[PDB]
Paper text:
The binuclear center, common to all MLLs, is coordinated by five histidine residues and two aspartic acid residues.
We solved the structure of [name] in complex with AHL-hydrolytic products bound to the active site through cocrystallization with C8-HSL. While the model of [name] in complex with the hydrolytic product of C8-HSL is limited in its accuracy by a relatively low ligand occupancy (∼0.7), it reveals that the negative charge of the hydrolytic product carboxylate group is stabilized by the bimetallic active site center, and that the alcohol group interacts with the α-metal (iron; 2.7 Å; monomer L).
Numbering used by the authors:
A (entry chain F), B (entry chain X): 8 to 283
Write the structure that this text describes.
């Protein structure tokens, strides 16, 4: 198999750096009212154009997220603002590659946060691969009518109305061979209820791990590890980063972080080419 | 048994409120450089004068913690400054009750942080009850020569030189009857590697849960729960708070928080009296 892997730029988000790096600048007797900063980072998605069928990793934010008529609650829009030109929307990035939503055989949802699961509703011809614990947690947010936080009610509403086809990865489930040189990694609980990664083996480029929010940035990754400011499972988070470090060492793979502005700058994006 | 329980005031600490309440005031598009606060809170200890023998819960900070010749690293003194008059030192609070260090039969160390294990070295005639996972973690900090952070090298150094007598609570160990109406609760990992609480049943006052840093304040406790800015085991922390809530409900017990300024103000301290 001679796949082509594309990095698609789906715009920029800002938030409190304390979300990204917990207690990054603690108050002191000399700086008792210490200030945070509002840091900018990329949202992106990965397309694997594979002869056995097209695989998409993450789906970015819904085009209807922001604004007075937006799906995102006003508090969410103010703490986690997303900025994107029309060329950044996932449907346009895919159209520029001559890829219609119906051509996607698999969507791997790293997790179901607003900045990863925003366009799942497009992929009505795919199998949506998601962690069972992540799916359960998001569906409880929906059933409880939660309007704030990182699980977007109107996104989930659209997944159910559009009759998406789900394959849940079970809590103790091995790492799933999707296609030649493409493996779903079950990271389990950490950043969210259930995290999935991807291990891709390309003939030219060699190994790539897509970590998504298992590892926000190179600063998260250290060593030593700098965890995020809120976390579902701190122990699982720390175990997941060290497991990724060991897999990268043993397989000589690059690690692609979820939201690293400096790493993302260096990628070849879908407007310039691809990785074989 | 007709015990007397004393609350001893061991002075005041300040730190970034984000340590106390994770992401208490997140940056927004309108407040992108949001300021934290440097909040003040009590350090205290509990003496149970029991006919079966005196039980101490926690030991506050070492009198030699602060200052240019202090045991605390300079970064620790600046992020977690302790202020205490000599009357606040545990040795003096106990002397004012005519209690010598040698009169303590049991010391329950909730955990081994700087603000709880600072005077263990005084209690050479006691059995020191500690969670096995907390002891292991602190002893690794000692062995790796760590000088910064919440585990004070020079305090651990004095515990070993003074030949303290340890009883470790094992990870799966039940809740230990120390004396009539005094039970050690094994909370397990959460805030730190291994947390112990106390459930005291007094004839007049009824039930008291000493939670220590399993629950910092009433704001932590909610509901809903507001976790602290850094945590060893987030899942264990959240389970521990709900377990304490259920025990309080099923036994009609008061919950005494680790560091709640408003609750502490309402306690009768060792200069005014005691609880029977
Ligand atoms: C009201 C509290 C909001 C919930 C905090 C978690 C939201 C979050 O972490 N959102 C994004 C930030 C970008 O990574 C994510 O983690 O994927
Ligand atoms: C160098 C970073 C310090 C480690 C952060 C945890 C220290 C901590 O939480 N210390 C005290 C704060 C007062 O409760 C404690 O939890 O007992
Ligand atoms: Co996320
Ligand atoms: Co503590
Ligand atoms: Fe994210
Ligand atoms: Fe404390």
């Amino acid at each position: 198999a001679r796949p082509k892997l594309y990095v698609m730029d789906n715009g920029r988000m800002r938030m409190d750096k304390n979300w990204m790096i917990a207690m990054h600048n603690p108050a002191t007797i000399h700086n008792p009212n210490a200030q945070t900063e509002f840091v900018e980072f990329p949202i992106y998605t990965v397309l694997i154009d594979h002869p056995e069928g097209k695989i998409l990793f993450d789906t970015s934010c819904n085009p209807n997220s922001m604004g007075p008529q937006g799906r995102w609650a006003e508090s969410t829009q103010q703490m986690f603002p997303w900025t994107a030109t029309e060329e950044c929307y996932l449907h346009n990035r895919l159209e520029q590659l001559k890829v219609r939503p119906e051509d996607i055989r698999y969507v791997v949802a790293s997790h179901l946060h607003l900045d990863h699961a925003g366009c799942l509703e497009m992929f009505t011809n795919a199998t949506i691969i998601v962690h069972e614990d992540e799916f359960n947690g998001a569906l409880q947010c929906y059933a409880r009518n939660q309007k704030e936080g990182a699980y977007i009610w109107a996104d989930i509403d659209a997944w159910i109305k559009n009759n998406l086809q789900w394959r849940t990865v079970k809590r103790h489930e091995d790492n799933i061979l999707l296609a030649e040189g493409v493996k779903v990694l079950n990271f389990g609980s950490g950043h969210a209820w259930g995290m999935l990664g991807l291990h891709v083996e390309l003939p030219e480029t060699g190994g790539i791990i897509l970590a998504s929010d298992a590892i926000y940035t190179a600063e998260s990754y250290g060593p030593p590890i700098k965890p995020p400011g809120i976390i579902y499972d701190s122990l699982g988070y720390m175990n997941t980063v060290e497991r990724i470090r060991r897999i990268a060492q043993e397989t000589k793979s690059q690690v692609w972080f979820g939201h690293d502005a400096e790493q993302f700058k260096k990628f070849r994006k879908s407007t310039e080419g691809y990785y074989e």
